[PDB]
Amino acid sequence: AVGACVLCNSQTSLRCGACIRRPFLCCKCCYDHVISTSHKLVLSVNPYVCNAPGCDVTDVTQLYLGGMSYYCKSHKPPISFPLCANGQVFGLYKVTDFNAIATCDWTNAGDYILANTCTERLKLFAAETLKATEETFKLSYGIATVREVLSDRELHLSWEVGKPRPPLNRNYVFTGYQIGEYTFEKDAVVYRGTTTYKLNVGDYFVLTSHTVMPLSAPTLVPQEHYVRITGLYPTLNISDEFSSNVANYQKVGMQKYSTLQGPPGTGKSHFAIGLALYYPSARIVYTACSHAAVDALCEKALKYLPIDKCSRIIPARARVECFDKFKVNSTLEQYVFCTVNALPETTADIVVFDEISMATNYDLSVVNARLRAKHYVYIGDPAQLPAPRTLLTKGTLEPEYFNSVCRLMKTIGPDMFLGTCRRCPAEIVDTVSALVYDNKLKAHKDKSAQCFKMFYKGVITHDVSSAINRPQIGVVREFLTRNPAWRKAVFISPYNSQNAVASKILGLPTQTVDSSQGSEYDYVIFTQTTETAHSCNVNRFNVAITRAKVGILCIMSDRDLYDKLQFTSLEI
Numbered sequence: 382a383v384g385a386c387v388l389c390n391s392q393t394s395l396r397c398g399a400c401i402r403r404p405f406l407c408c409k410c411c412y413d414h415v416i417s418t419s420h421k422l423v424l425s426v427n428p429y430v431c432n433a434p435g436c437d438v439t440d441v442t443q444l445y446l447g448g449m450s451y452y453c454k455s456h457k458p459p460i461s462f463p464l465c466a467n468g469q470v471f472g473l474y475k476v477t478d479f480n481a482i483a484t485c486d487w488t489n490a491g492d493y494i495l496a497n498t499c500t501e502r503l504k505l506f507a508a509e510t511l512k513a514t515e516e517t518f519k520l521s522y523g524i525a526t527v528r529e530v531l532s533d534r535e536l537h538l539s540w541e542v543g544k545p546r547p548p549l550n551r552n553y554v555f556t557g558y559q560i561g562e563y564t565f566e567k568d569a570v571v572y573r574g575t576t577t578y579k580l581n582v583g584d585y586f587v588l589t590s591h592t593v594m595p596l597s598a599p600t601l602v603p604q605e606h607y608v609r610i611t612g613l614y615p616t617l618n619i620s621d622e623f624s625s626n627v628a629n630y631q632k633v634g635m636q637k638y639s640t641l642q643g644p645p646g647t648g649k650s651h652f653a654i655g656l657a658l659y660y661p662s663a664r665i666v667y668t669a670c671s672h673a674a675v676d677a678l679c680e681k682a683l684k685y686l687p688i689d690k691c692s693r694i695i696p697a698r699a700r701v702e703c704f705d706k707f708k709v710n711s712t713l714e715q716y717v718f719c720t721v722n723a724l725p726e727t728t729a730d731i732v733v734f735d736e737i738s739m740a741t742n743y744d745l746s747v748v749n750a751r752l753r754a755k756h757y758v759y760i761g762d763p764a765q766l767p768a769p770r771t772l773l774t775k776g777t778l779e780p781e782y783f784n785s786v787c788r789l790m791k792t793i794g795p796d797m798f799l800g801t802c803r804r805c806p807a808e809i810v811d812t813v814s815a816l817v818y819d820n821k822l823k824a825h826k827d828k829s830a831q832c833f834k835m836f837y838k839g840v841i842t843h844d845v846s847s848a849i850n851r852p853q854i855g856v857v858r859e860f861l862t863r864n865p866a867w868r869k870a871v872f873i874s875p876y877n878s879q880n881a882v883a884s885k886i887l888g889l890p891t892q893t894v895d896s897s898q899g900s901e902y903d904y905v906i907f908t909q910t911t912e913t914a915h916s917c918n919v920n921r922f923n924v925a926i927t928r929a930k931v932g933i934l935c936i937m938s939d940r941d942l943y944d945k946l947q948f949t950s951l952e953i
């Protein structure tokens with residue numbers, strides 16, 4: 382009950398009992414909170430409540446110290462001091478932004494802006510509070526009791542009346558009952574059980590709510606610049622494949638942390654693995670939020686690094702399949718590949734944090750808390766997709782508010798920019814270069830003459846709120862008959878429900894833009910589906926079209942994004 386004040390450090394006994402995290406506030410700061418917010422409960426060893434029997438006055442502004450004990454105006458003895466005077470609340474050892482963070486519901490963009498423009502200790506407060514609020518929100522949805530099982534990938538669900546029915550995408554992971562995590566896709570619903578088990582009739586699912594631990598470490602450790610490469614030993618024989626990245630690899634060694642902005646297909650994983658071959662003694666921990674991000678860094682490591690010094694760390698609560706070709710759960714290997722959530726407490730010469738646009742400030746903190754490293758390298762692209770903010774429903778979260786790393790990349794610029802896309806036909810590179818990279822992204826590849834756009838608004842139907850455009854799928858079906866090379870194309874849309882319909886009618890493999898991020902396919906068919914803020918998001922659009930190595934067909938709903946596409950237009 383005796384801690385440091387989460388604004389100005391000053392020691393105190395005073396926590397806010399009305400904040401859901403119960404931060405230590407100093408007397409000067411605890412006042413400025415309780416006199417400007419609905420927050421009136423102050424905690425110490427014993428709470429600031431009237432000590433008089435059967436009295437329910439808990440508001441610190443209405444209370445006094447009568448000797449050793451606390452009382453209201455109705456109960457205080459004659460010789461009694463008010464708890465709230467001279468800009469202080471009586472405690473031992475005797476903020477606008479803090480107030481907004483403490484009282485916001487996290488449904489407004491402006492909440493996330495503030496949680497990223499504030500001081501560093503407030504960003505940790507912001508991050509615990511948000512994650513806490515995100516988790517206490519999960520409780521608010523209804524249970525799904527199984528009515529009838531049909532097959533091994535279809536069942537019928539009965540939903541708890543009174544409480545809302547949560548969105549049934551790959552984003553919302555359920556816990557069955559204890560029969561391992563489960564997911565759902567659209568009364569013909571598809572059940573994807575992480576642990577295989579013949580789905581019991583009467584068994585029920587609930588959204589996994591995990592206790593939010595406190596944050597000690599900053600999002601970003603303070604920035605150190607060195608005159609010499611510190612604690613790392615470069616090779617002089619450095620394989621020509623990685624010669625582009627030498628001057629950036631020497632930057633990495635002459636700073637505490639470095640930011641790398643790599644637009645799609647610019648050699649981010651090449652750089653991350655190229656760092657181990659340049660500092661070949663250095664112990665490196667490769668981390669990202671998702672199993673797919675970590676498994677891609679593993680694929681690159683298998684090609685260029687010795688397999689006996691590589692370990693893939695897997696949490697005992699195995700939620701998906703992931704990389705098998707390394708030794709599993711050897712914490713002590715030179716090369717450690719691990720999702721942020723499963724990190725051990727370790728030291729490292731270098732930590733590489735990949736897919737940084739998907740990182741929350743919570744994630745940035747946990748990494749500084751689990752990994753103690755000479756150098757931190759932050760790899761991703763603020764022009765790509767952020768982690769979904771399930772509470773945010775009002776306003777759009779701009780890239781500079783994604784996390785502290787993206788804020789740095791969008792303000793002072795990144796330390797290192799991979800400026801040549803080697804994946805995408807020039808038509809795609811030229812479009813996204815103008816759209817999100819201020820014309821600084823260059824095409825290696827020639828124009829493919831296999832990049833098509835069609836403006837076709839079609840008809841928008843909705844499965845709950847997820848959008849479908851059958852006519853846009855119909856246009857694709859027509860195109861495929863005349864373009865058999867596209868038979869092998871991945872179908873991409875901003876909506877699962879669209880993808881579900883496109884699966885049945887086209888037979889193509891299916892990916893949402895968000896789940897496509899980090900992957901590449903020869904041919905891509907993209908139906909925008911709707912003209913919403915979701916489907917017009919320039920970051921989502923950027924990712925959607927940069928998945929393609931050879932060709933893309935974009936059926937567009939939005940005039941602006943249609944006109945910007947530097948593609949041959951089709952008719953019909």
Ligand SMILES: CC(C)Nc1nc2ccccc2[nH]1
Pocket residue numbers: 622623625647648651803
């Ligand atoms: C062509 C072979 C050697 N691999 C290779 N060289 C790269 C250089 C920069 C970015 C990505 C790269 N991938």
Ligand SMILES: CC(C)Nc1nc2ccccc2[nH]1
Pocket residue numbers: 725726727728750751752753
């Ligand atoms: C330095 C001593 C006290 N042990 C220690 N504490 C750690 C915390 C995070 C990562 C690695 C750590 N190793």
Ligand SMILES: [Zn+2]
Pocket residue numbers: 397398399400414420483
């Ligand atoms: Zn409070």
Ligand SMILES: [Zn+2]
Pocket residue numbers: 386387388389390391406407408409410411
């Ligand atoms: Zn203080």
Ligand SMILES: [Zn+2]
Pocket residue numbers: 431432433436437438452453454455456
């Ligand atoms: Zn009283």
